[PDB]
Motif scaffolding. Structure first.
Motif, PDB file in Angstrom:
ATOM      1  N   UNK A 183       0.848  -1.196   0.000  1.00 14.98           N
ATOM      2  CA  UNK A 183       0.000   0.000   0.000  1.00 14.98           C
ATOM      3  C   UNK A 183       0.829   1.169   0.000  1.00 14.98           C
ATOM      4  N   UNK A 184       0.273   2.301  -0.423  1.00 13.26           N
ATOM      5  CA  UNK A 184       1.047   3.529  -0.478  1.00 13.26           C
ATOM      6  C   UNK A 184       1.346   4.195   0.857  1.00 13.26           C
ATOM      7  N   UNK A 185       2.081   5.322   0.848  1.00 16.85           N
ATOM      8  CA  UNK A 185       2.443   6.070   2.058  1.00 16.85           C
ATOM      9  C   UNK A 185       1.278   6.618   2.702  1.00 16.85           C
ATOM     10  N   UNK A 186       1.398   6.990   3.989  1.00 19.84           N
ATOM     11  CA  UNK A 186       0.214   7.550   4.648  1.00 19.84           C
ATOM     12  C   UNK A 186      -0.141   8.813   4.074  1.00 19.84           C
ATOM     13  N   UNK A 187      -1.425   9.151   4.139  1.00 16.07           N
ATOM     14  CA  UNK A 187      -1.880  10.409   3.576  1.00 16.07           C
ATOM     15  C   UNK A 187      -1.511  11.636   4.391  1.00 16.07           C
ATOM     16  N   UNK A 188      -1.735  12.841   3.841  1.00 21.34           N
ATOM     17  CA  UNK A 188      -1.422  14.093   4.531  1.00 21.34           C
ATOM     18  C   UNK A 188      -2.195  14.265   5.724  1.00 21.34           C
ATOM     19  N   UNK A 189      -1.681  15.059   6.681  1.00 19.46           N
ATOM     20  CA  UNK A 189      -2.480  15.242   7.893  1.00 19.46           C
ATOM     21  C   UNK A 189      -3.674  15.952   7.536  1.00 19.46           C
ATOM     22  N   UNK A 190      -4.728  15.813   8.335  1.00 20.00           N
ATOM     23  CA  UNK A 190      -5.971  16.500   8.037  1.00 20.00           C
ATOM     24  C   UNK A 190      -5.901  18.005   8.246  1.00 20.00           C
ATOM     25  N   UNK A 191      -6.966  18.734   7.893  1.00 18.46           N
ATOM     26  CA  UNK A 191      -6.977  20.191   8.061  1.00 18.46           C
ATOM     27  C   UNK A 191      -7.051  20.568   9.457  1.00 18.46           C
ATOM     28  N   UNK A 192      -6.584  21.781   9.799  1.00 18.89           N
ATOM     29  CA  UNK A 192      -6.671  22.185  11.202  1.00 18.89           C
ATOM     30  C   UNK A 192      -8.057  22.249  11.581  1.00 18.89           C
ATOM     31  N   UNK A 193      -8.332  22.031  12.864  1.00 19.95           N
ATOM     32  CA  UNK A 193      -9.698  22.053  13.349  1.00 19.95           C
ATOM     33  C   UNK A 193     -10.375  23.413  13.364  1.00 19.95           C
ATOM     34  N   UNK A 194     -11.686  23.459  13.657  1.00 26.02           N
ATOM     35  CA  UNK A 194     -12.444  24.714  13.699  1.00 26.02           C
ATOM     36  C   UNK A 194     -12.117  25.494  14.878  1.00 26.02           C
ATOM     37  N   UNK A 195     -12.503  26.787  14.905  1.00 29.51           N
ATOM     38  CA  UNK A 195     -12.183  27.574  16.103  1.00 29.51           C
ATOM     39  C   UNK A 195     -12.936  27.113  17.247  1.00 29.51           C
ATOM     40  N   UNK A 196     -12.432  27.398  18.443  1.00 25.85           N
ATOM     41  CA  UNK A 196     -13.114  26.982  19.655  1.00 25.85           C
ATOM     42  C   UNK A 196     -14.291  27.872  20.022  1.00 25.85           C
ATOM     43  N   UNK A 197     -14.992  27.568  21.126  1.00 23.21           N
ATOM     44  CA  UNK A 197     -16.145  28.358  21.573  1.00 23.21           C
ATOM     45  C   UNK A 197     -15.741  29.636  22.093  1.00 23.21           C
TER      46      UNK A 197
END
Lengths: 27, 27, 27
Positions: free
Chosen positions: B3-17
């Motif tokens: 299988x191929x290399x791991x994918x890119x990290x995901x996008x940064x999360x949403x702002x907090x409350x």
């Protein structure tokens, strides 16, 4: 070959906005 | 193949409350 | 065979922390 595994979750998000102003003071 | 290399990290999360309301005002 | 393609991006990150306390209230 098959695609690789999905990546890790991303970084934590930005801090939230500052809170609202507080209540008025004593009379 | 393997299988191929791991994918890119995901996008940064949403702002907090928003933060808590502020302290009451001065007398 | 050739290695597979890189994986997909990961999930979004967690939401951020709550924001700073708000301004003091009016006098």
């Amino acid at each position: 070959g098959p695609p690789g595994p999905p990546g890790p979750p991303g970084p934590p998000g930005p801090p939230g906005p500052p809170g609202p102003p507080g209540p008025p003071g004593p009379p």
